Design a binder for this molecule. Structure first.
Ligand SMILES: [Mg+2]
Ligand SMILES: [Mg+2]
Ligand SMILES: [Mg+2]
Ligand SMILES: [Mg+2]
Ligand SMILES: [Mg+2]
Ligand SMILES: [Mg+2]
Ligand SMILES: [Mg+2]
Ligand SMILES: [Mg+2]
Ligand SMILES: [Mg+2]
Ligand SMILES: [Mg+2]
Ligand SMILES: [Mg+2]
Ligand SMILES: [Mg+2]
Ligand SMILES: [Mg+2]
Ligand SMILES: [Mg+2]
Ligand SMILES: [Mg+2]
Ligand SMILES: [Mg+2]
Ligand SMILES: [Mg+2]
Ligand SMILES: [Zn+2]
Lengths: 60, 83, 127, 152, 99, 116
RNA sequence: GGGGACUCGUGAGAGACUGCCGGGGUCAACUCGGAGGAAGGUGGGGAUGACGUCAAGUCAUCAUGCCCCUUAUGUCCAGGGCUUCACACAUGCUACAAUGGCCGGUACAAAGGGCUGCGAUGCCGCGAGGUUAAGCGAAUCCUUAAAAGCCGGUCUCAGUUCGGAUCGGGGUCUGCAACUCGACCCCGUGAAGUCGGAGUCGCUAGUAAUCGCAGAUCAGCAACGCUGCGGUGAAUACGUUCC
């Protein structure tokens, strides 16, 4: 989103409940999986590129 | 804060302004910006121009608005009857 | 050497321990009436034993796990059928034609994205 | 469908009453997956009918279904500027299914309290040939016979 | 006695069994009581993502994260074999855990 | 018979008849019956004036009845109206007060669809 | 303890590929039926989306050519709002009851989650919840009680022992802060609604139908959304003229 908001999130916040989790690749504040820390779209692209140990396509 | 384990929720920077005046007098119109502070039974006789987004609404407690909140009396939205 | 086979219907597996006996379904402390109040289940179980011959003979006992009432009943039926087949290979045509030997593979259809259930879809509502 | 017929799934015989008929009625009255509840309702109705009559419930049911078995249907068709009904013959299985559905539907919306006595009264009325299912069968038969001219 | 335990876990297939039975199972000559690798159920982590970057909710792709655990043997804490085990190291794709 | 209201629906368990009073429902009737001792499953026609007169004092001892409860309710809402809070303004406009959405709902507080 | 007897778990194979036979078919394709079998013609399902179209969507996942501001169209903070409300639409839930409601007892799952946590028991409280505390990086601990199912009593077709929207009072949890602007618990009050017009939606087998379980986002807000899991569990297809 905005790099200013990225820096504001990354910094130590007063009233710590004001903090939030964003994507580690693009900074998307939504659809961030705490297991990886990336957003949904970035996670899908990373999975397709196969740079996640253990993450691959599922069929069942 | 709506729990019988910590008392009410009153802002410290509000107490240090109301308790330093109620000793001698009921102060005149006052500026406040924290609508979320509870009314302790020390605001009787005083006035509070509580912010509502665009301006400050002066609110006077007589006897009953002790369990209420400062922003309870400040319309945050305005509706005026489409028809 | 006790006779033990594998029997499943939907999700339940029963480990038969068929031995010679008089015949009374031991299902871990609960009798046939105690466990299964359904006449359909009480016939489905003991169907393989009375399908040909004979006629209310040696009992079985199998552990219980998974599924529901009908699934457990079917698993027990298949287990008794396979145990009878193993004990006596002569009546193999009987149960084989009766269809008590088939596993009957039938599992719940997995839910698919975009549909409110496995096959039920949301309302179309064109335009 | 277009690619030929589809075989119909088989049924089992009830240990209490060794006939596919009773299982058919249980299947027809079954709703929300409560096969045990449908069996309970049908058994209560059958026991009530036996209490009121004395003869065998399966025999009473057979008399009822023979009385309420229809002959022709009134399936409609459209050709040009008007639509008219075409009376055609009915197979025994389809006739039995239609009669059972009619009996169950008319027992569902009767003026009694529970489906035990409701279905007992319905099956008794069908056995005596004077019930709602019998009336519906007569209406269908006569209204189809009134369209005998268009029998193509 | 039966003190030393292994909690080998790998995120990939065909490497866990090899790096167990050809590295840890080298202590059969060293003289450690081996029970053999015990195949525990595979873990399965299920996550769902939307294929499109915008507004197409019905396009979803699913992924599975499998983790395989085995080799929970109770091999004896003989000094020679335990020193050999701590000196040898397995590839990072499999995680070793000495209990 | 009448204590405050009719309290006597014909052929009804008094457990549910007590719910017909303004101040007692299922749980209040159950706790009252638990305290008193009289069984729940009994037809109201079989109840006797002695049981009525032991029941009459219990309700007024701690609970409350028709009239004064609604007087307290109306006094509360009227005070809320005159003090002029957000909830009081919502009550004055007839709109629901507990933060419920007003775009497509609140048909109970308002009337049915006006269709102007 | 003892055991690999058994499931089971997870590594490797066999098997189901018209394999074999009968009739037919240009003898070929293939069609129809049989024995053995877990399954018969693709055993069932998932992933798998051709040339291209809609100047389809995304300049707000990200990135990018041209223009636009640089005491501002950059940035921060404190409140408000993104949640309004004469109305209409779309998607889900609830009912309108006796296949039922309540009271007591009672049996059977899968798949998941867990050191900013799962809180086994014990105590307080009708209750949600609070307290001290063991085990648990987990097939050994928690979740964990499954609900539908079964039994005995009550209610007796009633706007009801159906219905839980609204309202008053009283508490709990997270959050510095819950009127806007959260969830849950207790009492009382207890609306419409009695099967829904023309019209319209989904569904062929473990399908529809019904009842519960788990995850992800998150301090709290998801037992009405999403994604998966399991139990019980049907009726119809004669036929392709007709939309
Ligand atoms: Mg957060
Ligand atoms: Mg299901
Ligand atoms: Mg649409
Ligand atoms: Mg292909
Ligand atoms: Mg365009
Ligand atoms: Mg666009
Ligand atoms: Mg961009
Ligand atoms: Mg919005
Ligand atoms: Mg919804
Ligand atoms: Mg109720
Ligand atoms: Mg109960
Ligand atoms: Mg307690
Ligand atoms: Mg009625
Ligand atoms: Mg009405
Ligand atoms: Mg109600
Ligand atoms: Mg209609
Ligand atoms: Mg959550
Ligand atoms: Zn991203």
């Amino acid at each position: 989103a905005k790099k200013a908001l990225v820096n504001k999130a990354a910094g130590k916040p007063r009233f710590a409940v004001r903090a939030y989790t964003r994507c580690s690749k693009c900074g998307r504040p939504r659809a961030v999986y705490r297991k990886f820390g990336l957003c949904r779209i970035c996670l899908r692209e990373m999975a397709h590129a196969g740079e996640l140990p253990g993450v691959q396509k599922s069929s069942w | 804060p709506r729990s019988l384990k910590k008392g009410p929720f009153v802002d410290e920077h509000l107490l240090k302004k109301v308790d330093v005046q109620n000793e001698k007098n009921t102060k005149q119109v006052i500026k406040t910006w924290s609508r979320r502070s509870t009314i302790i039974p020390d605001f009787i006789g005083h006035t509070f121009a509580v912010h509502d987004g665009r301006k400050h609404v002066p609110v006077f407690v007589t006897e009953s608005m002790v369990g209420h909140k400062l922003g309870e009396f400040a319309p945050t939205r305005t509706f005026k009857g489409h028809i | 050497r006790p006779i033990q086979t594998v029997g499943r219907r939907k999700e339940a597996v029963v480990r038969v321990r068929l031995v010679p006996g008089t015949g009374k379904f031991d299902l871990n402390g609960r009798s046939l009436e105690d466990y299964f109040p359904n006449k359909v289940h009480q016939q489905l179980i003991k169907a393989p034993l009375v399908t040909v011959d004979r006629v209310e003979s040696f009992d079985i006992f199998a552990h219980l796990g998974g599924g529901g009432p009908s699934g457990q009943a079917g698993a027990l039926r298949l287990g008794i059928a396979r145990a009878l087949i193993l004990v006596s290979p002569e009546d193999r045509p009987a149960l084989k034609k009766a269809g008590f030997l088939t596993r009957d593979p039938r599992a719940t259809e997995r839910k698919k994205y975009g549909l409110k259930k496995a096959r039920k879809a949301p309302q179309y509502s064109k335009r | 469908p277009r690619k030929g017929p589809a075989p119909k799934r088989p049924l089992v015989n009830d240990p209490v009453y060794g006939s596919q008929l009773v299982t058919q009625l249980v299947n027809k009255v079954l709703l929300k997956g409560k096969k045990s509840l449908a069996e309970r309702i049908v058994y209560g109705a059958l026991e009530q009918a036996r209490d009121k009559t004395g003869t065998d419930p399966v025999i009473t049911l057979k008399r009822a279904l023979d009385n309420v078995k229809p002959a022709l249907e009134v399936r409609s068709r459209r050709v040009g500027g008007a639509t008219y009904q075409v009376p055609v013959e009915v197979r025994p299985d389809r006739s039995t299914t239609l009669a059972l559905r009619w009996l169950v539907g008319y027992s569902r919306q009767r003026r009694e309290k529970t489906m035990i006595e409701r279905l007992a009264n319905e099956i008794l009325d069908a056995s005596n040939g004077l019930g709602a299912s019998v009336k519906r069968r007569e209406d269908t038969h006569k209204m189809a016979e009134a369209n005998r001219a268009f029998a193509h | 006695g039966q003190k030393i335990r292994i909690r080998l876990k790998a995120y990939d297939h065909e490497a866990i069994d090899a790096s167990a039975r050809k590295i840890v199972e080298t202590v059969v000559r060293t003289g450690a009581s081996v029970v053999g690798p015990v195949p525990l159920p595979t873990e399965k982590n299920v996550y769902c993502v939307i294929r499109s970057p915008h507004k197409y909710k019905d396009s979803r792709e699913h992924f599975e994260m499998r983790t395989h655990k085995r080799l929970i043997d109770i091999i004896d804490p003989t000094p020679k074999t335990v020193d050999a085990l701590m000196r040898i190291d397995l590839p990072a794709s499999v995680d070793v855990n000495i209990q | 018979a009448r204590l405050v209201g009719v309290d006597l629906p014909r052929d009804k368990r008094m457990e549910v008849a007590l719910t017909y009073i303004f101040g007692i429902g299922r749980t209040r009737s159950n706790e009252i019956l638990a305290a008193t001792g009289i069984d729940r499953d009994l037809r109201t026609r079989d109840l006797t004036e002695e049981q009525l007169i032991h029941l009459r004092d219990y309700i007024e001892a701690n609970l409350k009845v028709e009239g004064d409860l609604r007087r307290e309710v109306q006094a509360d809402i009227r005070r809320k109206i005159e003090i002029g809070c957000y909830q009081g303004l919502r009550h004055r406009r007839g709109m629901p007060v507990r933060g419920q959405r007003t775009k497509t709902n609140a048909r109970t507080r308002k009337g049915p669809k006006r269709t102007i």
